[model samples]
Target: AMEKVQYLTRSAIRRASTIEMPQQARQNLQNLFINFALILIFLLLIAIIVMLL
Candidate 1:
């Protein structure tokens, strides 16, 4: 049972191909998402703090 599950998982992985984005583009997107998320959280905390104070 475990072997069959592993086989199917491996086959699916083998069939999967990487998306067409270049490494630099992928890094840019990653940085954008990280920065955006950080800024969003920072602003959110400040908003909460302002409400409290």
Candidate 2:
């Protein structure tokens, strides 16, 4: 069985409730690019080395 999740109103979240939409999106994209790069390198290392080991 899965746990139920209640809907959160706009006020419940910290982001849109405070920061402007454009600024939030710009920062979010920058962080996402960096995170995606790191995740790719990590997975590549696993695939490359695990098979050899």
Candidate 3:
């Protein structure tokens, strides 16, 4: 029973670690998406202004 518990604990920890994304990579992806949206919005606003002029 004790050996089974230890095996289970180790396997769980390994699985958890494997499922996690690296912090820097995740942040980079998030920032990329946010920047893309911001740029798109800016372009749309500029187009609207040009049409109005």
Best by TM-score: 1
Which model is ahead, 2 or 3, in terms of TM-score? 3
**Span of 10 residues, lowest total lDDT, candidate 3:** 17-26
Q: What is the lDDT of residue 52 in candidate 3?
A: 78
What TM-score, to 2 decimals, does candidate 2 have?
Answer: 0.45
TM-score of each: 0.49, 0.45, 0.48
Assess the local accuracy of residue 34 in candidate 1 as a C-alpha lDDT between 0 and 100: 85
Q: Report lDDT (Cα) of residue 9, candidate 3.
A: 55
- Poorest lDDT segment (10 consecutive residues) of candidate 2: 2-11
Q: What does candidate 1's lDDT look like per residue over 1-53, in tens digits? A: 34533433545655444333324334466679889999999999999999977
Rank the candidate models, highest TM-score first. Answer: 1, 3, 2
Q: Per-residue lDDT tens digits of candidate 2, residues 1-53?
A: 55354323334566553543334445576679889999999999999898977
Candidate 3 lDDT score at position 21: 32
Which lDDT values do the candidates have, in the order given? 0.63, 0.64, 0.64
State the local distance difference test value for candidate 3: 0.64
